[PDB]
């Protein structure tokens with residue numbers, strides 16, 4: 001008699017049968033999170049995390065949104081956190097967009113008729129933009145926290161040179177250096193938390209993944225004239241990773257009739273984990289913006 005094989009487990013050895021999950025189109029398990037209110041939800045909102053991190057870092061934002069009577073949901077992107085896949089590798093950047101859409105489509109089956117919002121940060125903001133551009137008119141709104149629209153220009157040249165080198169030869173292990181954690185936030189406690197979290201991948205960026213992030217930048221630029229979704233865009237003026245010029249370009253080139261930019265003077269990249277004055281404002285402004293569009 002044949003027997004069922006041992007249960008599929010996360011990269012951290014936890015059986016997926018013990019966790020909320022979804023299987024993507026490539027047969028890979030994605031770890032999922034849900035924060036639902038006690039009453040009937042006013043809307044759904046998907047939270048899209050950034051490169052090397054994971055959905056658990058959105059706990060406080062998600063609980064705020066749940067307190068507005070939205071049903072919040074998320075998953076760890078392939079290659080990240082508690083989801084399957086080689087760490088920080090993706091066959092094509094569109095895998096991330098496809099998987100968001102699968103999760104959104106699945107949730108709308110269970111909660112039909114509700115508006116759906118997207119919230120994304122950094123790489124996750126690029127994913128959110130491409131998700132909305134693929135389905136014009138489908139999403140009620142998008143909250144973008146320092147989305148990847150243009151990378152730091154000096155850093156971008158580095159990834160472009162390395163890309164051309166790997167694109168010409170066979171160098172599967174080539175990587176750039178790791179992201180300098182000190183540029184993430186002026187809040188030193190949050191920098192220390194980032195450096196302490198075992199679910200964060202702090203290795204150097206593999207050139208193959210950097211190529212896919214360059215693909216995201218190129219695709220985002222082409223998507224802007226197709227973007228009509230309402231959005232709120234939050235950007236630090238001293239962001240050394242996602243250059244503020246990208247935020248201004250998004251405001252200029254998106255066709256959305258409802259678009260708002262808030263600049264945080266002197267703030268670094270991870271605005272929802274910045275100095276308390278900035279983080280409190282970020283939470284408050286997202287609260288107001290979503291409240292006004294779900295009332």
Ligand SMILES: O=C1CO[C@H]2CCN(C(=O)N3CCC(C(c4ccccc4)c4ccccc4)CC3)C[C@H]2N1
Nearest residue numbers: 050051053122123151152155159210213214241270
């Ligand atoms: O909370 C967190 C923790 O990790 C933080 C760093 C990674 N990041 C996140 O999506 N990231 C998206 C990818 C960029 C990356 C880059 C840019 C400038 C300098 C070094 C690296 C890049 C690489 C190739 C092409 C384009 C852009 C870095 C930012 C999430 C963010 N948020």
